[PDB]
């Protein structure tokens, strides 16, 4: 009934989907192959898995996910991995060649042959479920299929779905470190074409999670698997109210109407607390006030930015585990009385809190400590105007000299699209400045 189809796009999307589905199967008791482990809940049906799993006549739990990469490498690793029997074969369609960090190639020439297949699979997965809540779409702004094909997917989903929620989990580029070089072009283009087609885009920037793993988890060299596990915990804390019993239940349709003030500003920031390791979680208790202060601390966001230099629009606090509403109220009131946290003037009341009793699930071999309670904060604030302006300057430095434009011109795209994307992000920066006055 509370079904959510997860569409993972690109290498980043496929890998974070691997971590997410490992966490989902572990917390719902599904064996990796396809089933419940025999004697576990013989009399108890325990139909909480229906959000993320479907039941067939063979008694096999099948996830409601679509894994798409235009390169058949990560999808082949999934198909030959430990979860080779969990996934339906047609839920993991793939292309023959990748976009190779090219929005025009991923959107106009080789993204037009996988879009029909992915929309047919999405149509089948939507007609299979009764009462779809929304699409959890996991991708990266870094370029390629995560910027071109994902945006084409949202453009088609706007046509044939409409009012259904479209929650993005987007890898945002780092202020300092990078992998590609045309990713400013890719980000500007994909933001211009997803501004009017998405609903709420949670920024899960990689450099901040690197420093979070280096600081709290005491990991000198973190890796993509650790970041994927953290993003899996973030999305599990987001979606836990649709599967577990909670005092204040939140669905996917509340996040947009409580975090998107204007249709252009729909880029909130996710963060988790605590992300402490075991040898240090032994030392002190982790109460509601302490985890709320950890969320509101500047050096705990999963984007490399300081929220003290901006103004909050609206915060969402999903408390998860052994938490009580009076400690929640006391923590939020203490935060509101704190001076370094400043709200924007047109939002007098600016929190949306959801209390859930299910404790966070611990992946064996993971790094996060086991705790009674945790909290996921989804904050919409003006501080990301730094990120938008920096990324836009990086775009301008390259577009001034027409660097790497001939690829996009050759792969079926006009430079008028570049000009309109730059003007659209200029308007977005003007909006982000003009809100704060």
């Amino acid at each position: 009934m509370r079904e959510c189809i997860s569409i993972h796009v690109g290498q980043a999307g496929v890998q974070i989907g691997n971590a997410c589905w490992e966490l989902y199967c572990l917390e719902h008791g599904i064996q990796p192959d396809g089933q419940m482990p025999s004697d576990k809940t013989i009399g108890g049906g325990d139909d909480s898995f229906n959000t993320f799993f479907s039941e067939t006549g063979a008694g096999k739990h099948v996830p409601r996910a679509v894994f798409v990469d235009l390169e058949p490498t990560v999808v082949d690793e999934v198909r030959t991995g430990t979860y080779r029997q969990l996934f339906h074969p047609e839920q993991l369609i793939t292309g023959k060649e990748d976009a190779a960090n090219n929005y025009a190639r991923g959107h106009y020439t080789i993204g037009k042959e996988i879009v029909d297949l992915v929309l047919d699979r999405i149509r089948k997965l939507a007609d299979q479920c009764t009462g779809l809540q929304g699409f959890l779409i996991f991708h990266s702004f870094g370029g390629g299929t995560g910027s071109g094909f994902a945006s084409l997917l949202m453009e088609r989903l706007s046509v044939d779905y409409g009012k259904k929620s479209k929650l993005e989990f987007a890898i945002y580029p780092a202020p300092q470190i990078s992998t590609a070089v045309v990713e400013p072009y890719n980000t500007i283009l994909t933001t211009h074409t997803t501004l009017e087609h998405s609903d709420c885009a949670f920024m899960v920037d990689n450099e901040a999670i690197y420093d979070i793993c280096r600081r709290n988890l005491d990991i000198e060299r973190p890796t993509y698997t650790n970041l994927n596990r953290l993003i899996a915990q973030i999305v599990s804390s987001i979606t836990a109210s649709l599967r577990f019993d909670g005092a204040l239940n939140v669905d996917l349709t509340e996040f947009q109407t409580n975090l998107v003030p204007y249709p252009r500003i729909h880029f909130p920031l996710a963060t988790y607390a605590p992300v402490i390791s075991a040898e240090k979680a032994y030392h002190e208790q982790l109460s509601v006030a302490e985890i709320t202060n950890a969320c509101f601390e500047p050096a705990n966001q999963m984007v490399k930015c300081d929220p003290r230099h901006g103004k909050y629009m609206a915060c969402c606090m999903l408390y998860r585990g052994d938490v009580v509403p009076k400690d929640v109220n006391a923590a939020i009131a203490t935060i509101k009385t704190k001076r370094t946290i400043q709200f924007v003037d047109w939002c007098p009341t600016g929190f949306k809190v959801g209390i859930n009793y299910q404790p966070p699930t611990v992946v064996p071999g993971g790094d996060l400590a086991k705790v009674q309670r945790a909290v996921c904060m989804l904050s919409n604030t003006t501080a990301i105007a730094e990120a938008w302006a920096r990324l836009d300057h990086k775009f301008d430095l390259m577009y001034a000299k027409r660097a790497f434009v001939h690829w996009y011109v050759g792969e079926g795209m006009e430079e008028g699209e570049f000009s309109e994307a730059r003007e659209d992000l200029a308007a977005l920066e003007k909006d982000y400045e003009e809100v704060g006055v």
């Binding site: 990991i219 000198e220 060299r221 973190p222 890796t223 698997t225 650790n226 790094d367």
Partner: peptide, 12 residues
């Protein structure tokens, strides 16, 4: 992932 960031990895 203990092999990547073991503090005695290059020793051992």
């Amino acid at each position: 992932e203990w092999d990547l960031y073991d503090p005695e990895a290059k020793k051992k």
